[PDB]
Nucleic acid binder design. Sequence first.
DNA 1: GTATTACACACCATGTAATAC
DNA 2: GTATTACATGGTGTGTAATAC
Lengths: 89, 89, 102, 101
Amino acid sequence: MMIKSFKHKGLKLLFEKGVTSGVPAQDVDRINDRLQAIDTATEIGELNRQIYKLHPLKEGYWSITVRANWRITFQFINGDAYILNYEDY
Amino acid sequence: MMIKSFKHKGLKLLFEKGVTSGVPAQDVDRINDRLQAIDTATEIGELNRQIYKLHPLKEGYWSITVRANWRITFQFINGDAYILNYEDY
Amino acid sequence: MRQFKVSHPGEMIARDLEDMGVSGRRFAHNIGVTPATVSRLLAGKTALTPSLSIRIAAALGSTPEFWLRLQSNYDLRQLENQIDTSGIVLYGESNEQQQNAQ
Amino acid sequence: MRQFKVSHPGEMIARDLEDMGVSGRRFAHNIGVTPATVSRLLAGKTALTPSLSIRIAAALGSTPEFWLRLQSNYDLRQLENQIDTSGIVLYGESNEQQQNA
DNA sequence: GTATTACACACCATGTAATAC
DNA sequence: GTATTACATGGTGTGTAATAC
Ligand SMILES: [Cl-]
Ligand SMILES: [Cl-]
Ligand SMILES: [Cl-]
Ligand SMILES: [Mg+2]
Ligand SMILES: [Mg+2]
Ligand SMILES: [Mg+2]
Ligand SMILES: [Mg+2]
Ligand SMILES: [Mg+2]
Ligand SMILES: [Mg+2]
Protein backbone atom coordinates (compact mmCIF):
# COMPACT_ATOMS: atom_id res chain seq x y z
CA MET A 1 0.00 0.00 0.00
CA MET A 2 1.09 3.58 -0.65
CA ILE A 3 2.66 5.57 2.17
CA LYS A 4 1.13 9.03 1.79
CA SER A 5 2.65 10.91 4.74
CA PHE A 6 5.23 10.55 7.51
CA LYS A 7 4.92 11.88 11.04
CA HIS A 8 8.42 10.61 11.88
CA LYS A 9 10.80 12.52 9.61
CA GLY A 10 13.53 9.92 10.08
CA LEU A 11 11.31 7.31 8.43
CA LYS A 12 10.67 9.78 5.60
CA LEU A 13 14.40 10.18 4.96
CA LEU A 14 14.88 6.41 5.07
CA PHE A 15 11.96 5.51 2.79
CA GLU A 16 12.28 8.34 0.26
CA LYS A 17 16.05 8.95 0.22
CA GLY A 18 17.74 5.89 1.74
CA VAL A 19 19.11 8.19 4.45
CA THR A 20 19.74 6.47 7.79
CA SER A 21 20.62 9.50 9.92
CA GLY A 22 17.10 9.77 11.37
CA VAL A 23 16.65 6.27 12.84
CA PRO A 24 18.65 4.21 15.35
CA ALA A 25 21.55 2.42 13.68
CA GLN A 26 20.68 -0.97 15.16
CA ASP A 27 17.16 -0.96 13.66
CA VAL A 28 17.83 0.41 10.15
CA ASP A 29 17.43 -2.94 8.40
CA ARG A 30 14.42 -4.04 10.47
CA ILE A 31 12.63 -0.71 9.96
CA ASN A 32 13.31 -0.74 6.22
CA ASP A 33 12.13 -4.36 6.10
CA ARG A 34 8.80 -3.39 7.67
CA LEU A 35 8.52 -0.33 5.43
CA GLN A 36 9.01 -2.68 2.48
CA ALA A 37 6.27 -4.94 3.86
CA ILE A 38 3.81 -2.04 4.16
CA ASP A 39 4.64 -0.74 0.68
CA THR A 40 4.12 -4.21 -0.83
CA ALA A 41 0.99 -5.31 1.04
CA THR A 42 -2.18 -4.75 -0.98
CA GLU A 43 -4.41 -5.50 2.04
CA ILE A 44 -4.00 -4.96 5.77
CA GLY A 45 -4.29 -8.71 6.43
CA GLU A 46 -1.13 -9.35 4.43
CA LEU A 47 0.76 -7.65 7.29
CA ASN A 48 -0.70 -10.06 9.88
CA ARG A 49 2.58 -11.88 10.44
CA GLN A 50 2.84 -12.97 14.06
CA ILE A 51 6.27 -11.39 14.52
CA TYR A 52 4.76 -8.06 13.46
CA LYS A 53 2.17 -8.34 16.27
CA LEU A 54 -0.34 -6.47 14.13
CA HIS A 55 -3.28 -5.01 16.06
CA PRO A 56 -5.53 -1.94 15.82
CA LEU A 57 -5.08 1.00 18.15
CA LYS A 58 -7.89 2.23 20.40
CA GLU A 59 -9.49 4.41 15.68
CA GLY A 60 -8.28 3.58 12.18
CA TYR A 61 -4.63 3.42 13.28
CA TRP A 62 -2.54 0.25 13.26
CA SER A 63 0.71 -0.92 14.83
CA ILE A 64 3.47 -3.36 13.90
CA THR A 65 6.45 -4.21 16.11
CA VAL A 66 10.02 -3.53 15.02
CA ARG A 67 11.77 -4.78 18.18
CA ALA A 68 10.91 -4.91 21.91
CA ASN A 69 8.45 -2.01 22.45
CA TRP A 70 9.62 -0.11 19.35
CA ARG A 71 6.76 -0.07 16.87
CA ILE A 72 5.67 1.46 13.57
CA THR A 73 2.25 3.11 13.61
CA PHE A 74 0.20 4.45 10.71
CA GLN A 75 -3.34 5.44 9.77
CA PHE A 76 -5.31 3.27 7.32
CA ILE A 77 -7.43 5.53 5.08
CA ASN A 78 -8.39 5.06 1.41
CA GLY A 79 -6.29 1.90 1.23
CA ASP A 80 -3.16 3.96 1.95
CA ALA A 81 -0.97 4.49 5.01
CA TYR A 82 -0.86 7.94 6.61
CA ILE A 83 1.06 9.52 9.49
CA LEU A 84 3.84 6.92 9.60
CA ASN A 85 5.51 6.99 13.01
CA TYR A 86 8.31 5.18 14.84
CA GLU A 87 7.94 5.32 18.62
CA ASP A 88 8.91 3.49 21.81
CA TYR A 89 5.65 2.30 23.35
CA MET B 1 -7.86 -3.76 -6.04
CA MET B 2 -10.65 -5.60 -4.24
CA ILE B 3 -14.07 -5.68 -5.88
CA LYS B 4 -16.48 -5.27 -2.97
CA SER B 5 -19.94 -5.17 -4.58
CA PHE B 6 -21.63 -5.77 -7.93
CA LYS B 7 -24.54 -3.79 -9.29
CA HIS B 8 -24.59 -6.00 -12.40
CA LYS B 9 -25.35 -9.50 -11.14
CA GLY B 10 -24.10 -11.02 -14.39
CA LEU B 11 -20.65 -9.64 -13.64
CA LYS B 12 -20.93 -11.14 -10.16
CA LEU B 13 -21.67 -14.61 -11.55
CA LEU B 14 -18.68 -14.31 -13.87
CA PHE B 15 -16.21 -13.00 -11.29
CA GLU B 16 -17.27 -15.10 -8.30
CA LYS B 17 -18.44 -18.36 -9.92
CA GLY B 18 -17.04 -18.34 -13.46
CA VAL B 19 -20.63 -18.42 -14.77
CA THR B 20 -21.17 -16.77 -18.16
CA SER B 21 -24.98 -16.83 -18.42
CA GLY B 22 -25.39 -13.24 -17.21
CA VAL B 23 -23.13 -11.49 -19.74
CA PRO B 24 -23.22 -11.38 -23.55
CA ALA B 25 -21.34 -14.25 -25.17
CA GLN B 26 -19.39 -11.93 -27.48
CA ASP B 27 -17.70 -10.10 -24.60
CA VAL B 28 -17.10 -12.81 -21.97
CA ASP B 29 -13.34 -12.93 -22.54
CA ARG B 30 -12.99 -9.14 -22.83
CA ILE B 31 -15.05 -8.56 -19.68
CA ASN B 32 -13.15 -11.17 -17.66
CA ASP B 33 -9.88 -9.64 -18.88
CA ARG B 34 -10.87 -6.22 -17.57
CA LEU B 35 -12.19 -7.68 -14.32
CA GLN B 36 -8.79 -9.35 -13.95
CA ALA B 37 -7.08 -6.01 -14.61
CA ILE B 38 -9.18 -4.24 -11.95
CA ASP B 39 -8.60 -7.07 -9.47
CA THR B 40 -4.83 -6.92 -10.12
CA ALA B 41 -4.36 -3.14 -10.20
CA THR B 42 -3.10 -1.64 -6.94
CA GLU B 43 -3.71 1.95 -8.09
CA ILE B 44 -6.25 3.59 -10.38
CA GLY B 45 -3.41 4.74 -12.65
CA GLU B 46 -2.38 1.16 -13.40
CA LEU B 47 -5.67 0.89 -15.33
CA ASN B 48 -4.86 3.90 -17.54
CA ARG B 49 -4.24 1.93 -20.71
CA GLN B 50 -5.37 3.85 -23.76
CA ILE B 51 -7.58 1.00 -25.00
CA TYR B 52 -9.45 1.09 -21.68
CA LYS B 53 -10.17 4.82 -22.16
CA LEU B 54 -10.05 5.29 -18.40
CA HIS B 55 -11.77 8.49 -17.26
CA PRO B 56 -13.83 9.55 -14.24
CA LEU B 57 -17.56 10.15 -14.45
CA LYS B 58 -19.16 13.55 -13.86
CA GLU B 59 -18.27 11.77 -8.96
CA GLY B 60 -15.90 9.18 -7.55
CA TYR B 61 -16.92 6.65 -10.21
CA TRP B 62 -14.78 5.54 -13.14
CA SER B 63 -15.39 4.03 -16.58
CA ILE B 64 -13.47 1.38 -18.51
CA THR B 65 -14.30 0.50 -22.11
CA VAL B 66 -15.00 -3.14 -22.97
CA ARG B 67 -15.96 -2.71 -26.63
CA ALA B 68 -17.67 0.00 -28.73
CA ASN B 69 -20.09 1.76 -26.32
CA TRP B 70 -20.11 -1.06 -23.75
CA ARG B 71 -18.22 -0.14 -20.59
CA ILE B 72 -17.49 -1.27 -17.04
CA THR B 73 -18.18 1.27 -14.30
CA PHE B 74 -17.31 1.20 -10.61
CA GLN B 75 -17.05 3.44 -7.56
CA PHE B 76 -13.55 3.99 -6.14
CA ILE B 77 -13.73 4.15 -2.33
CA ASN B 78 -11.18 3.01 0.28
CA GLY B 79 -8.91 1.71 -2.48
CA ASP B 80 -11.62 -0.77 -3.52
CA ALA B 81 -14.08 -1.06 -6.40
CA TYR B 82 -17.79 -0.81 -5.60
CA ILE B 83 -21.03 -0.98 -7.59
CA LEU B 84 -19.48 -2.79 -10.55
CA ASN B 85 -21.75 -2.36 -13.57
CA TYR B 86 -21.72 -3.32 -17.25
CA GLU B 87 -23.81 -0.99 -19.41
CA ASP B 88 -24.22 0.31 -22.97
CA TYR B 89 -23.52 4.05 -22.76
CA MET C 1 -13.49 -12.93 -3.02
CA ARG C 2 -10.97 -14.18 -5.57
CA GLN C 3 -11.68 -14.18 -9.29
CA PHE C 4 -12.87 -17.59 -10.45
CA LYS C 5 -11.57 -17.63 -14.04
CA VAL C 6 -8.03 -16.31 -14.59
CA SER C 7 -6.37 -16.03 -18.00
CA HIS C 8 -2.73 -16.35 -18.97
CA PRO C 9 -1.58 -12.73 -19.53
CA GLY C 10 -0.29 -13.61 -23.00
CA GLU C 11 -3.78 -14.56 -24.15
CA MET C 12 -5.09 -11.26 -22.74
CA ILE C 13 -2.54 -9.33 -24.80
CA ALA C 14 -3.40 -11.37 -27.90
CA ARG C 15 -7.06 -10.40 -27.52
CA ASP C 16 -5.99 -6.78 -27.02
CA LEU C 17 -3.70 -6.77 -30.06
CA GLU C 18 -6.46 -8.26 -32.21
CA ASP C 19 -8.84 -5.51 -31.06
CA MET C 20 -6.14 -2.92 -31.84
CA GLY C 21 -5.35 -4.39 -35.25
CA VAL C 22 -1.67 -4.92 -34.37
CA SER C 23 0.04 -8.01 -35.73
CA GLY C 24 2.33 -10.15 -33.62
CA ARG C 25 5.20 -9.29 -35.96
CA ARG C 26 4.73 -5.53 -35.57
CA PHE C 27 4.34 -5.86 -31.80
CA ALA C 28 7.61 -7.81 -31.67
CA HIS C 29 9.43 -5.22 -33.79
CA ASN C 30 8.09 -2.49 -31.49
CA ILE C 31 8.95 -3.92 -28.06
CA GLY C 32 12.27 -5.24 -29.37
CA VAL C 33 11.90 -9.03 -29.28
CA THR C 34 11.69 -11.62 -32.03
CA PRO C 35 8.29 -12.64 -33.45
CA ALA C 36 8.92 -16.17 -32.16
CA THR C 37 8.86 -14.90 -28.57
CA VAL C 38 5.67 -12.86 -29.07
CA SER C 39 4.06 -15.88 -30.74
CA ARG C 40 4.87 -18.16 -27.80
CA LEU C 41 3.81 -15.50 -25.29
CA LEU C 42 0.51 -14.71 -27.02
CA ALA C 43 -0.14 -18.46 -27.35
CA GLY C 44 0.30 -18.87 -23.59
CA LYS C 45 3.24 -21.25 -23.99
CA THR C 46 5.85 -19.10 -22.21
CA ALA C 47 5.57 -16.79 -19.22
CA LEU C 48 5.57 -13.00 -19.10
CA THR C 49 9.06 -12.51 -17.66
CA PRO C 50 10.22 -9.41 -15.73
CA SER C 51 12.19 -8.22 -18.77
CA LEU C 52 9.07 -8.60 -20.93
CA SER C 53 6.97 -6.68 -18.39
CA ILE C 54 9.28 -3.69 -18.86
CA ARG C 55 9.02 -3.87 -22.65
CA ILE C 56 5.26 -4.48 -22.64
CA ALA C 57 4.43 -1.60 -20.28
CA ALA C 58 6.28 0.75 -22.65
CA ALA C 59 3.94 -0.32 -25.48
CA LEU C 60 0.58 -1.22 -23.90
CA GLY C 61 0.64 1.21 -20.98
CA SER C 62 0.24 0.60 -17.26
CA THR C 63 3.30 -0.26 -15.17
CA PRO C 64 5.85 -3.09 -15.40
CA GLU C 65 4.74 -4.25 -11.93
CA PHE C 66 1.14 -4.61 -13.12
CA TRP C 67 2.01 -6.99 -15.96
CA LEU C 68 4.40 -8.98 -13.77
CA ARG C 69 1.73 -9.21 -11.06
CA LEU C 70 -0.65 -10.74 -13.61
CA GLN C 71 1.87 -13.49 -14.37
CA SER C 72 2.60 -13.98 -10.66
CA ASN C 73 -1.07 -14.39 -9.75
CA TYR C 74 -1.52 -16.72 -12.72
CA ASP C 75 1.56 -18.73 -11.69
CA LEU C 76 0.17 -19.16 -8.17
CA ARG C 77 -3.23 -20.26 -9.51
CA GLN C 78 -1.58 -23.30 -11.13
CA LEU C 79 0.47 -24.27 -8.07
CA GLU C 80 -1.46 -23.53 -4.86
CA ASN C 81 -3.22 -26.92 -5.01
CA GLN C 82 -0.16 -28.84 -6.29
CA ILE C 83 2.15 -28.25 -3.29
CA ASP C 84 1.42 -30.17 -0.08
CA THR C 85 1.68 -27.67 2.79
CA SER C 86 -0.20 -29.78 5.36
CA GLY C 87 3.08 -30.66 7.09
CA ILE C 88 4.24 -27.04 7.33
CA VAL C 89 3.83 -25.48 10.78
CA LEU C 90 2.94 -21.81 11.22
CA TYR C 91 5.40 -20.20 13.63
CA GLY C 92 3.67 -18.66 16.63
CA GLU C 93 0.20 -19.51 17.92
CA SER C 94 -2.05 -22.06 16.23
CA ASN C 95 -5.86 -22.10 16.32
CA GLU C 96 -5.90 -24.06 19.58
CA GLN C 97 -3.19 -21.94 21.20
CA GLN C 98 -5.16 -18.76 20.44
CA GLN C 99 -8.23 -20.13 22.25
CA ASN C 100 -6.34 -21.12 25.41
CA ALA C 101 -4.93 -17.60 25.78
CA GLN C 102 -8.48 -16.21 25.57
CA MET D 1 6.96 7.78 -3.85
CA ARG D 2 8.81 4.49 -4.28
CA GLN D 3 11.02 3.04 -1.57
CA PHE D 4 14.65 4.04 -2.07
CA LYS D 5 16.29 0.99 -0.46
CA VAL D 6 14.94 -2.46 -1.37
CA SER D 7 16.19 -5.77 0.02
CA HIS D 8 16.24 -9.25 -1.45
CA PRO D 9 13.32 -11.16 0.16
CA GLY D 10 15.62 -13.91 1.43
CA GLU D 11 17.75 -11.43 3.37
CA MET D 12 14.59 -10.13 5.05
CA ILE D 13 13.63 -13.68 5.99
CA ALA D 14 17.14 -14.32 7.33
CA ARG D 15 16.82 -11.30 9.62
CA ASP D 16 13.38 -12.48 10.73
CA LEU D 17 14.58 -16.02 11.46
CA GLU D 18 17.50 -14.54 13.41
CA ASP D 19 15.05 -12.55 15.54
CA MET D 20 12.83 -15.62 15.99
CA GLY D 21 15.73 -17.89 16.92
CA VAL D 22 14.98 -20.35 14.11
CA SER D 23 17.92 -22.00 12.36
CA GLY D 24 18.05 -22.34 8.60
CA ARG D 25 18.10 -26.11 8.98
CA ARG D 26 14.93 -26.11 11.10
CA PHE D 27 13.24 -23.72 8.67
CA ALA D 28 14.13 -26.01 5.76
CA HIS D 29 12.79 -29.10 7.54
CA ASN D 30 9.58 -27.21 8.35
CA ILE D 31 8.79 -25.82 4.89
CA GLY D 32 9.98 -28.98 3.12
CA VAL D 33 13.13 -28.08 1.16
CA THR D 34 16.76 -28.93 1.74
CA PRO D 35 18.91 -26.67 3.95
CA ALA D 36 20.99 -25.94 0.84
CA THR D 37 18.01 -24.17 -0.75
CA VAL D 38 17.26 -22.16 2.40
CA SER D 39 20.93 -21.23 2.77
CA ARG D 40 21.08 -19.88 -0.79
CA LEU D 41 17.71 -18.14 -0.42
CA LEU D 42 18.70 -16.48 2.86
CA ALA D 43 22.06 -15.48 1.36
CA GLY D 44 20.25 -13.70 -1.48
CA LYS D 45 21.82 -15.99 -4.09
CA THR D 46 18.60 -17.53 -5.46
CA ALA D 47 15.19 -15.95 -6.00
CA LEU D 48 12.02 -16.60 -4.03
CA THR D 49 10.12 -18.75 -6.53
CA PRO D 50 6.33 -19.21 -6.72
CA SER D 51 6.72 -22.66 -5.13
CA LEU D 52 8.75 -21.22 -2.25
CA SER D 53 6.22 -18.43 -1.68
CA ILE D 54 3.54 -21.05 -1.02
CA ARG D 55 5.74 -22.92 1.46
CA ILE D 56 7.02 -19.74 3.12
CA ALA D 57 3.54 -18.27 3.62
CA ALA D 58 2.54 -21.47 5.42
CA ALA D 59 5.39 -20.91 7.92
CA LEU D 60 6.04 -17.16 8.17
CA GLY D 61 2.47 -15.97 7.61
CA SER D 62 0.96 -13.53 5.13
CA THR D 63 -0.10 -14.73 1.67
CA PRO D 64 1.90 -16.47 -1.08
CA GLU D 65 1.21 -13.54 -3.41
CA PHE D 66 2.73 -11.14 -0.87
CA TRP D 67 6.03 -13.02 -0.80
CA LEU D 68 6.10 -13.39 -4.59
CA ARG D 69 5.31 -9.68 -4.95
CA LEU D 70 8.40 -8.90 -2.86
CA GLN D 71 10.54 -10.92 -5.29
CA SER D 72 8.83 -9.42 -8.35
CA ASN D 73 9.37 -5.82 -7.21
CA TYR D 74 12.96 -6.72 -6.31
CA ASP D 75 13.51 -8.29 -9.74
CA LEU D 76 12.24 -5.12 -11.41
CA ARG D 77 14.56 -2.95 -9.32
CA GLN D 78 17.54 -4.95 -10.60
CA LEU D 79 16.46 -4.57 -14.24
CA GLU D 80 16.22 -0.82 -13.73
CA ASN D 81 17.74 1.10 -16.67
CA GLN D 82 19.16 -2.22 -17.91
CA ILE D 83 16.63 -2.55 -20.76
CA ASP D 84 16.65 0.17 -23.41
CA THR D 85 12.97 1.03 -23.95
CA SER D 86 13.54 4.38 -25.71
CA GLY D 87 12.85 2.72 -29.06
CA ILE D 88 9.51 1.31 -27.88
CA VAL D 89 6.46 3.29 -29.02
CA LEU D 90 3.40 3.66 -26.82
CA TYR D 91 0.31 2.74 -28.82
CA GLY D 92 -2.24 5.53 -29.12
CA GLU D 93 -1.56 9.21 -28.46
CA SER D 94 1.85 10.45 -27.35
CA ASN D 95 2.51 13.69 -25.45
CA GLU D 96 2.40 15.84 -28.59
CA GLN D 97 -0.71 14.11 -29.97
CA GLN D 98 -2.52 14.69 -26.66
CA GLN D 99 -1.80 18.43 -26.86
CA ASN D 100 -3.08 18.94 -30.42
CA ALA D 101 -6.29 17.03 -29.63
C1' DG E 1 22.67 -29.83 15.21
C1' DT E 2 24.58 -26.24 12.06
C1' DA E 3 25.94 -23.46 7.45
C1' DT E 4 27.95 -23.31 2.89
C1' DT E 5 28.84 -24.78 -2.01
C1' DA E 6 30.59 -27.56 -6.26
C1' DC E 7 28.45 -30.56 -9.27
C1' DA E 8 24.84 -32.71 -11.92
C1' DC E 9 20.43 -32.14 -13.44
C1' DA E 10 15.85 -30.52 -14.91
C1' DC E 11 13.31 -26.75 -16.25
C1' DC E 12 12.38 -22.79 -19.02
C1' DA E 13 12.90 -18.49 -21.92
C1' DT E 14 14.97 -16.72 -26.32
C1' DG E 15 17.02 -16.37 -30.92
C1' DT E 16 17.82 -18.54 -35.27
C1' DA E 17 15.91 -20.22 -39.10
C1' DA E 18 12.98 -23.36 -41.22
C1' DT E 19 8.26 -24.05 -43.13
C1' DA E 20 3.76 -22.37 -44.79
C1' DC E 21 0.63 -18.87 -45.99
C1' DG F 1 4.00 -8.95 -44.37
C1' DT F 2 2.32 -12.88 -41.53
C1' DA F 3 2.33 -17.02 -37.67
C1' DT F 4 4.25 -21.21 -35.82
C1' DT F 5 7.99 -24.35 -33.98
C1' DA F 6 12.23 -27.63 -33.66
C1' DC F 7 16.72 -26.97 -32.24
C1' DA F 8 20.69 -25.09 -29.80
C1' DT F 9 21.81 -22.20 -26.31
C1' DG F 10 22.20 -19.77 -21.80
C1' DG F 11 20.51 -18.81 -17.46
C1' DT F 12 18.56 -20.52 -13.01
C1' DG F 13 16.60 -23.18 -9.07
C1' DT F 14 17.09 -27.60 -6.54
C1' DG F 15 18.91 -31.92 -4.39
C1' DT F 16 22.95 -34.62 -3.27
C1' DA F 17 26.72 -34.89 -0.76
C1' DA F 18 31.13 -33.16 0.63
C1' DT F 19 33.51 -30.01 3.92
C1' DA F 20 33.90 -27.58 8.26
C1' DC F 21 32.27 -26.37 12.63
CL1 LIG G 1 5.02 13.52 4.72
CL1 LIG H 1 -22.52 -7.69 -4.43
CL1 LIG I 1 3.21 -19.58 -18.44
MG1 LIG J 1 -8.81 -3.03 0.21
MG1 LIG K 1 -3.59 -16.23 -31.27
MG1 LIG L 1 17.51 -13.24 -6.67
MG1 LIG M 1 21.21 -20.33 -30.72
MG1 LIG N 1 18.32 -17.28 -21.71
MG1 LIG O 1 20.85 -34.69 -8.33
